[PDB]
Design a binder for this molecule. Structure first.
Ligand SMILES: CCCCCCCCCCCCCCCCCC(=O)OC[C@H](CO[C@@H]1O[C@H](CO[C@H]2O[C@H](CO)[C@H](O)[C@H](O)[C@H]2O)[C@H](O)[C@H](O)[C@H]1O)OC(=O)CCCCCCCCCCCCCCCCC
Ligand code: CLA
Ligand code: CLA
Ligand code: CLA
Ligand code: CLA
Ligand SMILES: CCCCCCCCCCCCCCCC(=O)OC[C@H](CO[C@@H]1O[C@H](CS(=O)(=O)O)[C@@H](O)[C@H](O)[C@H]1O)OC(=O)CCCCCCCCCCCCCCC
Ligand code: KC2
Ligand SMILES: CC1=C(C#C/C(C)=C/C=C/C(C)=C/C=C/C=C(C)/C=C/C=C(\C)C#CC2=C(C)C[C@@H](O)CC2(C)C)C(C)(C)C[C@H](O)C1
Ligand SMILES: CC1=C(C#C/C(C)=C/C=C/C(C)=C/C=C/C=C(C)/C=C/C=C(\C)C#CC2=C(C)C[C@@H](O)CC2(C)C)C(C)(C)C[C@H](O)C1
Ligand SMILES: CC1=C(C#C/C(C)=C/C=C/C(C)=C/C=C/C=C(C)/C=C/C=C(\C)C#CC2=C(C)C[C@@H](O)CC2(C)C)C(C)(C)C[C@H](O)C1
Ligand SMILES: CC1=CCCC(C)(C)[C@H]1/C=C/C(C)=C/C=C/C(C)=C/C=C/C=C(C)/C=C/C=C(C)/C=C/C1=C(C)CCCC1(C)C
Ligand SMILES: CCCCCCCCCCCCO[C@H]1O[C@H](CO)[C@@H](O[C@H]2O[C@H](CO)[C@@H](O)[C@H](O)[C@H]2O)[C@H](O)[C@H]1O
Ligand code: SF4
Lengths: 74, 153, 180, 171, 176, 160, 42, 61, 176
């Protein structure tokens, strides 16, 4: 049981790190919005133009990582 | 459409050579027909293979019955080469010998000049026994068919 | 226009009669989607293995190698009683044989990459019996028909042995019809 | 047509020059195998079977001292088994194999066309210097007869437990 | 065009047969990807390691240094028994030797495996030098194979190679 | 033995077997003999007994709870618990991935790759499926020939 | 058979359903004839 | 780079950065981004064509 | 002129230059290996076996004061000190190395194209004349072959009967 819950904790840490690291590294730009640094850290979106750009910010990466961090600590 | 299993990598977009080696027509007994270096068939042809195999069999004949044979006691007695002790090799008084290459006795195989020996011999079991195709003590397939044809409900 | 083996069905388009044993038998049309070269290679391999299988099932019932491990008239029992290490050795040797005989071309994408590679021709002719053009066609037809007959015979032998739980010759000599 | 089988056509691989060639090959083994290999095999079988039949008859007639003691009076294949246990058959097989290595070399020189099948150039007394074709026909005919004869002797021994002459005496 | 080792396969592009120990054997094409000089140096070093290892797998079974008489004839058991201090000294000696290799690989160019060690001057004759290069490569390969086999046989039987041969327990009883 | 006891000689394992069999027998007591329910429950009892006996003889280790535990550390005495099954998986998974990649490239070099990806060319797909059996040597051959790994300058990447 | 019908059978969802049903049958029959295999037998 | 030639894109903001396209036309009038490149891969916006400068495209071998 | 095996062709590589050549090579080792190396091996074996036959004869009657006498010459080897055996082995190794000029392998043994079996050993100058040189080359090769066979026979019969050669001849007992 400890083994299984430990690997659950490993999953949680790795996924929270995934969200946060992706947000940090794509904060300056991505293929969808290659000029994100111009818009900053916590802009709402870039519109429905290129198929939809909801939650395309590093602030949004933080916002999702906070659900995952609450899941892991739980 | 595409016919699958063509065997041609270009059809499936897989890497392949551009010039394929031609197939010579030379055969070596106990070998294969295919591309070989020059003089390979001449040097290592069917003659080479067969004569080497004959030499191998002739060398097997001593090996199969390998062992120190002595008539000092008055009768031919065989003793494993492992028994002999060799000087000048420190702790290892007894050293590997031909029995290491050919452990016939360990597996309980009685080798002989010909492959098999008396103790380890091919077993021929007669399948027929005392059966006959028809009207015999054993009930054969033909007997079954006959009995069914002559059966009474 | 119509197949020779099955008159009411049309002749399989991909079967042009060049291959030995070709009677236009392909009712399900496998040759349309599978290369006939691959199919014939597989057919010859299966036929050769089943030729050897029938010969072995029939022979090792009467003649065995020395030893209790090899003493088994029933072939399905021999499968289990024979030394497991020996059987694994046979498996590894078959793998190496496939690799070397096919010359590293053992996949559906590369088997016939060389134009010289012909279906079922692995370069196996130790005694050079196939170098005579006059008898080569007859030998090819004989090989194909033998492979087919041996495949059917091996299948029948295996399942009749499953049923009767007795060797093939022993069954035929002491036949006992199936009851439940 | 074939002189031996009038209603069958002459086997192609059989030109008729070879000793003992009467066009007898109804099953066409010559069309399958190299006729030089087949001729070498036939001559080998001929010589071995002639020696075997003569040895059977001469063993019925006489037995060397010591061998009778070792074999316990056994005959034919029973003598083979007893003397295999003794070790004599091992010596015979070793030296026959030594001969057969050079036999393999000679077989491949035959297959290369350099040597006539069965020709080991062994004629110390020079018997084969007056009509070699006649002597070859005699050898082949005697070898075929001896193959059949050794078959008969060995299988009569299997039937009865008796050697050739002893069988002919009792029967 | 055709490989010597595999007559039915095309010769590897990088292996043209000029380098010592080359018979065109590269079925998986390591030479195409990895640096051939590095591969040759690694092969030579492995061959030397395993030549010494194969010699030392059997030497203690024949004679032992008086200090290590008690240590087992099984090389693995002897390794366990030696103790941290002797192993540390061996490690320091090996690292001092490997410092020269480090220098020759990362800060120098030279023939693969050439560390300047030829005290007896046996490599001055070019023909003997070529024979010795090929012999070193091939003996190293044979030693690699033999020492791998020896390590696994010791794992199975828990005995030395000569002891295993003499007792004729050539065959396994399962995993250890 | 590592930290636990063999399951073949564990009172907890025996108690679990007894409990399962007793539950099944209690369920069986309310059904007439020879009826389909009785036969099904008897077969369940036989299967339970066979499973427990096989687990006992397999050499599995069982804890205080009476349930088999797996030693997935690399120990050869317990290879059949994780390593050999893991090797079988890796074989099958590499087969699947190799054949999928081969078909992707095949469709890439077609007249309509998207059409080949939604409506498959099952002859070629089966060809690749067959090829997938030597995927380890094939994949390594691709890697060494340089057809597997793409160059850094030939893969699209976002701006920094 | 109609080539259009064969293409329809070759469509992605049909092939996925057939292949996964075949795989499920394989696993189910493996567990039916060799049940309760928690380990590779060694 | 000429017409009907494979060119790899070097514009970092481009959906096809370090990707290959086919030059459809090169305008010699003197506009800022003369070359026109057509791609098989469609972008997020759904366009498979773009205008590039001569310094943002490199011919492939 | 006469061929050893009349029914086999004269081997291509045996042209009669070497002494004792009667076209005897049915298995054709000359077609695979260098005839110079083969003749060097033949002469070395023949010389070792000539000395070995003389040693078998002498050892059974005469024993050096320092050593103890075994029952048979083959057993004399086991009776003698091991360090003495090792000294003899190493002296033979040094003799071989010096005589071959540290060219001991097929690659370089004949790099100077020295005649096979010609190690420059003629202290008494018995080989000065030419015709005597040829006749004695034939005598040497024939005697070496005969001594090879004779040494094999003596070794094996001594191992079997556990008696010296002359002792066996004087008291001959059939094996069975
Ligand atoms: C396809 C085209 C060919 C078709 C041609 C056939 C046309 C049909 C003609 C009828 C032939 C019936 C065949 C049944 C033979 C049989 O069941 O065969 C069984 C018999 C077995 O032998 C019998 O075995 C009997 C076994 O006895 C037992 O069985 C007897 C009855 O079975 C009694 O019951 C007896 O008491 C009981 O002990 C006897 O003891 C004798 O041995 C003998 O009569 O086969 C023999 O005799 C062995 C003879 C060797 C077979 C040779 C055939 C091949 C010849 C090719 C030439 C090359 C040959 C070299
Ligand atoms: C690479 C070399 C090699 C080696 C060293 C061995 C070693 C062995 N094999 Mg063999 N084997 C090999 C290649 C080899 N095999 C190959 C290539 C194949 C496939 C063609 C086999 C197929 C095979 C089988 C099927 C069996 C063996 C068995 C054996 C054992 C025989 C023991 C004995 O005393 O037999 C002495 C007996 C003989 C020399 C008689 C030879 C009989 C043949 C048919 C001729 C032994 C461990 C047996 C085993 O494991 O027994 C426990 C066994 O059953 N082997
Ligand atoms: C988290 C760290 C860790 C890691 C990465 C490993 C890794 C390994 N352990 Mg494990 N182990 C660990 C912790 C770890 N262990 C701990 C903490 C313990 C104590 C509880 C053990 C106790 C243990 C034992 C008792 C054994 C292992 C063994 C092994 C090896 C099994 C495979 C093998 O031998 O392949 C070898 C095969 C090849 C190199 C190639 C094979 C080629 C063909 C395909 C066959 C493997 C390298 C086994 C071993 O032999 O390790 C050396 C072994 O017996 N481990
Ligand atoms: C019955 C038990 C079971 C089940 C139902 C699954 C199910 C799954 N496993 Mg598997 N797995 C199992 C046992 C099982 N596993 C065991 C016992 C092991 C230990 C060896 C693994 C080890 C394993 C790994 C290492 C991975 C999976 C993955 C997966 C998932 C995707 C597999 C896939 O897409 O294949 C189709 C195949 C492909 C798409 C090809 C690429 C991926 C495969 C696995 C590569 C195989 C070859 C490669 C050289 C291996 C390198 C491994 C190394 C880096 C550690 C899937 C849910 C994958 C996953 O979770 O990815 C996120 C994955 O990467 N499994
Ligand atoms: C110069 C060569 C030479 C000579 C003169 C002899 C002489 C003899 N050897 Mg032989 N022998 C030789 C080489 C030689 N050997 C070689 C090279 C080997 C192989 C290693 C042997 C192995 C050998 C063994 C194993 C035995 C003899 C024995 C004999 C005696 C009887 C041989 C026999 O059957 O006669 C020839 C018979 C024929 C039918 C010839 C035709 C005899 C004194 C036997 C002996 O001394 O028993 C007491 C005995 O047991 N020899
Ligand atoms: C239990 C049973 C297991 C034991 C049985 C052992 C037999 C394994 C056979 C493997 C095989 O045939 O590989 C076939 C592959 C073909 O790969 C192909 O080789 C192709 C080129 S070619 O075939 O090498 O000419 C290449 O283009 C292609 O990508 C590649 O997939 O052969 C090779 O490419 C290299 C083979 C490795 C040689 C060393 C093996 C030593 C053992
Ligand atoms: C090719 C043959 C050969 C050569 C060329 C050769 C040359 C030299 C030289 C000069 C280079 C010296 C200086 C020298 C010295 C010693 N030799 Mg030696 N020797 C040869 C052969 C044997 C044998 C067979 C034995 C032997 C021995 C000894 C002992 C010790 C004796 C003892 O232990 O009392 C000593 C001191 C005996 C021995 O070690 O016995 C256990 C012993 O049996 N030697 N030996
Ligand atoms: C190729 C080649 C060579 C070769 C070779 C070799 C070794 C060739 C070997 C060929 C072999 C072994 C052929 C075997 C064929 C067997 C058949 C057709 C069986 C049919 C059984 C049937 C119908 C049945 C049945 C039955 C069933 C099921 C039910 C039963 O109640 C009844 C019954 C038993 C009748 C060599 C080595 C010479 C080299 C040469 O250079 C090239
Ligand atoms: C090479 C060569 C030379 C030579 C030589 C040598 C050594 C030649 C040796 C020749 C030999 C031994 C010939 C033997 C032939 C035997 C036959 C035909 C047997 C037939 C048996 C039959 C028909 C029978 C039978 C029977 C059967 C079936 C069953 C029995 O119940 C009944 C019965 C007995 C009737 C010399 C040395 C001269 C030098 C020369 O320069 C060249
Ligand atoms: C550089 C240089 C120098 C030098 C030097 C030196 C010191 C060179 C030393 C070289 C050495 C020690 C080479 C050792 C090779 C050993 C091998 C090939 C073993 C193979 C074993 C096998 C195949 C096996 C096996 C087996 C296995 C696995 C299973 C067993 O059941 C059976 C068996 C036993 C058969 C010096 C110092 C002179 C200076 C000079 O200026 C040049
Ligand atoms: C660190 C540690 C942990 C636990 C064990 C121990 C305490 C000993 C310690 C040390 C372990 C060590 C040093 C292990 C080393 C393992 C070694 C050296 C293994 C060697 C494996 C070698 C193998 C397969 C070789 C396979 C060769 C093959 C097919 C050859 C086949 C071939 C043939 C037959 C014909 C020509 C072509 C080709 C391919 C060359
Ligand atoms: C000749 C040198 C070749 C070196 C390369 C060998 C590499 C791989 C060798 C693997 C070990 C051999 O495999 C072996 O394990 C089996 C385990 O049941 C043995 O199994 C059997 O073997 C012996 C008879 O041969 C019996 O006395 C054993 O009691 C029995 O377990 C087989 O003898 C053989 O199959
Ligand atoms: S839905 Fe997504 S995209 Fe549309 S507006 Fe709200 S956030 Fe921006």
């Amino acid at each position: 049981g400890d083994f299984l819950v430990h690997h659950a904790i490993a999953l949680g840490l790795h996924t929270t790190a995934l969200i946060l690291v992706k947000g940090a590294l794509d904060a300056r730009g991505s293929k969808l919005m290659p000029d994100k640094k111009d818009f900053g850290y916590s802009f709402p979106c870039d519109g429905p133009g290129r198929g939809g750009t909801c939650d395309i910010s590093a602030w949004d990466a933080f916002y999702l990582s906070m659900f995952w961090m609450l899941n892991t600590i739980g | 459409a595409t016919v699958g299993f063509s065997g041609v990598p270009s059809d499936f977009c897989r890497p392949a050579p551009t010039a394929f080696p031609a197939e010579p027509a030379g055969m070596t007994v106990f070998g294969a027909r295919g591309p070989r270096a020059e003089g390979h068939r001449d040097k290592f042809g069917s003659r080479h293979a067969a004569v080497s195999l004959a030499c191998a069999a002739l060398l097997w004949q001593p090996i199969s019955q390998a062992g120190m044979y002595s008539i000092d006691s008055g009768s031919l007695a065989k003793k494993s080469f492992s028994e002999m002790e060799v000087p000048g090799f420190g702790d290892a008084k007894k050293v590997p010998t031909i029995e290491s290459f050919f452990p016939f006795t360990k597996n309980g195989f009685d080798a002989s000049p010909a492959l098999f020996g008396k103790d380890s011999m091919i077993v021929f079991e007669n399948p027929l026994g005392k059966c006959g195709a028809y009207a015999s003590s054993c009930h054969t397939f033909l007997d079954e068919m006959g009995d069914m044809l002559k059966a009474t409900p | 226009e119509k197949s020779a083996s099955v008159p009411f069905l049309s002749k399989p388009e991909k079967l042009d009669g060049s291959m030995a044993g070709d009677v236009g038998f392909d009712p399900l049309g496998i040759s349309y989607f599978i290369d006939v070269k691959w199919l014939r290679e597989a057919e010859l391999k299966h036929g050769r293995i089943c030729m050897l299988a029938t010969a072995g099932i029939l022979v090792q019932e009467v003649i065995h190698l020395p030893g209790p491990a090899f003493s088994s008239k029933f072939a399905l029992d021999a499968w289990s009683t024979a030394p497991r290490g020996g059987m694994v050795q046979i498996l590894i040797a078959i793998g190496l044989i496939e690799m070397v005989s096919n010359r590293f071309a053992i996949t559906a994408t590369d088997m016939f990459a060389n134009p010289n590679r012909k279906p079922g021709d692995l370069g196996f002719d130790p005694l050079s019996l196939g170098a005579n053009p006059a008898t080569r066609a007859k030998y090819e037809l004989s090989e194909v028909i033998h492979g087919r007959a041996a495949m059917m015979g091996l299948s029948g032998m295996i399942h009749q042995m499953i049923v009767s739980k007795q060797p093939v010759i022993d069954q035929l000599l002491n036949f006992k019809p199936v009851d439940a | 047509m074939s002189p031996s089988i009038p209603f069958l056509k002459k086997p192609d691989a059989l030109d008729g020059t070879a000793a003992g060639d009467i066009g007898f090959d109804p099953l066409g083994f010559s069309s399958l195998a190299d006729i030089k290999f087949l001729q070498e095999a036939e001559i080998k079988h001929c010589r071995i079977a002639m020696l075997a039949a003569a040895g059977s008859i001469a063993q019925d007639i006489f037995t060397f001292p010591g061998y009778s003691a070792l074999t316990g009076g056994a005959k034919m294949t029973a003598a083979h088994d007893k003397l295999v246990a003794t070790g004599t058959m091992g010596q015979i097989l070793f030296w026959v194999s030594f001969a057969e290595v050079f036999g393999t070399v000679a077989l491949f020189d035959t297959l290369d066309g350099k040597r006539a099948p069965g020709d080991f150039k062994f004629d110390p007394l020079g018997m084969g210097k007056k009509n070699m074709a006649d002597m070859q026909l005699k050898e082949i005919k005697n070898g075929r007869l001896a193959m059949l004869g050794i078959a008969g002797m060995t299988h009569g021994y299997f039937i009865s437990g008796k050697g050739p002459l002893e069988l002919l005496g009792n029967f | 065009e055709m490989s010597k080792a595999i007559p039915f396969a095309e010769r590897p592009a990088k292996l043209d047969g000029k380098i010592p120990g080359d018979v065109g054997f590269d079925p998986l094409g390591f030479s195409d990807y990895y640096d051939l000089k590095y591969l040759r140096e690694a092969e030579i070093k492995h061959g030397r390691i395993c030549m010494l290892g194969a010699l030392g797998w059997l030497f203690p079974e024949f004679a032992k240094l008086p200090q290590f008489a008690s240590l087992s004839t099984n090389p693995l058991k002897a390794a366990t028994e030696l103790g941290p201090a002797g192993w540390a000294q061996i490690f320091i000696f090996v690292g001092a030797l490997e410092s020269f290799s480090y220098e020759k690989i990362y800060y120098g160019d030279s023939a693969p495996g050439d560390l300047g060690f030829d005290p007896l001057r046996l490599g001055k004759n070019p023909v003997s030098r070529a024979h010795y290069e090929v012999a070193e490569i091939k003996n190293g390969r044979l030693a690699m194979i033999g020492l791998g086999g020896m390590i696994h046989h010791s794992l199975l039987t828990k005995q030395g190679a000569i002891e295993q041969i003499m007792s004729q327990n050539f065959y396994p009883s399962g995993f250890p | 033995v590592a930290g636990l006891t063999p399951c073949k000689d564990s009172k907890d394992f025996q108690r679990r077997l007894d409990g399962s069999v007793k539950k099944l027998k209690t369920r069986l007591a309310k059904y007439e003999k020879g009826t389909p329910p009785a036969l099904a429950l008897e077969k369940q009892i036989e299967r339970t007994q066979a499973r427990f006996e096989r687990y006992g003889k397999a050499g599995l280790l069982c804890g205080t709870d009476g349930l088999p535990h797996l030693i997935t550390d690399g120990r050869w005495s317990h290879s059949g618990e994780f390593v050999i099954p893991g090797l079988f998986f890796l074989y099958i998974a590499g087969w699947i991935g190799w054949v999928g990649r081969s078909y992707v490239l095949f469709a890439r070099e077609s007249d309509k790759p998207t059409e080949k990806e939604i409506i498959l060319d099952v002859p070629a797909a089966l060809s690749f499926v067959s090829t997938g059996f030597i995927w380890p040597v094939s994949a390594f051959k691709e890697f060494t020939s340089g057809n597997l790994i793409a160059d850094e300058s030939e893969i699209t990447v976002s701006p920094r | 058979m109609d080539s259009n019908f064969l293409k329809y059978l070759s469509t992605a969802p049909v092939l996925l359903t057939v292949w996964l049903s075949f795989t499920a049958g394989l696993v189910i029959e493996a567990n039916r004839f060799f049940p309760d295999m928690l380990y590779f037998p060694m | 780079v000429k017409r009907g030639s494979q060119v790899r894109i070097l514009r970092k903001e481009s959906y096809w950065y370090q990707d290959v396209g086919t030059v459809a036309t090169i305008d010699t009038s003197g506009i800022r981004y003369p070359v026109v490149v057509r791609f098989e891969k469609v972008s997020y916006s759904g366009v498979n064509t773009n205008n590039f400068s001569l310094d943002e495209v490199v011919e492939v071998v | 002129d006469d061929l050893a095996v009349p029914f086999l062709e004269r081997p291509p590589m045996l042209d009669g230059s070497y002494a004792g050549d009667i076209g005897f090579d049915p298995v054709g080792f000359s077609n695979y290996f260098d005839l110079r190396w083969l003749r060097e091996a033949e002469l070395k074996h023949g010389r070792v076996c000539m000395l070995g036959v003389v040693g078998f004869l002498v050892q059974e009657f005469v024993t050096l004061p320092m050593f103890s006498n075994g029952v048979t010459p083959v057993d004399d080897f086991f009776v003698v000190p091991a360090t003495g055996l090792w000294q003899i082995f190493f002296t033979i190794g040094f003799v071989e190395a010096f005589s071959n000029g540290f060219k001991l392998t097929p690659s370089d043994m004949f790099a100077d194209d020295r005649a096979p079996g010609d190690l420059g050993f003629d202290p008494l100058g018995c080989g000065k004349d030419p015709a005597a040189l040829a006749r004695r080359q034939l005598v040497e090769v024939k005697n070496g072959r005969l001594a090879m066979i004779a040494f094999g026979g003596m070794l094996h019969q001594q191992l079997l009967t556990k008696q010296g050669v002359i002792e066996q001849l004087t008291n001959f007992k059939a094996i069975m």
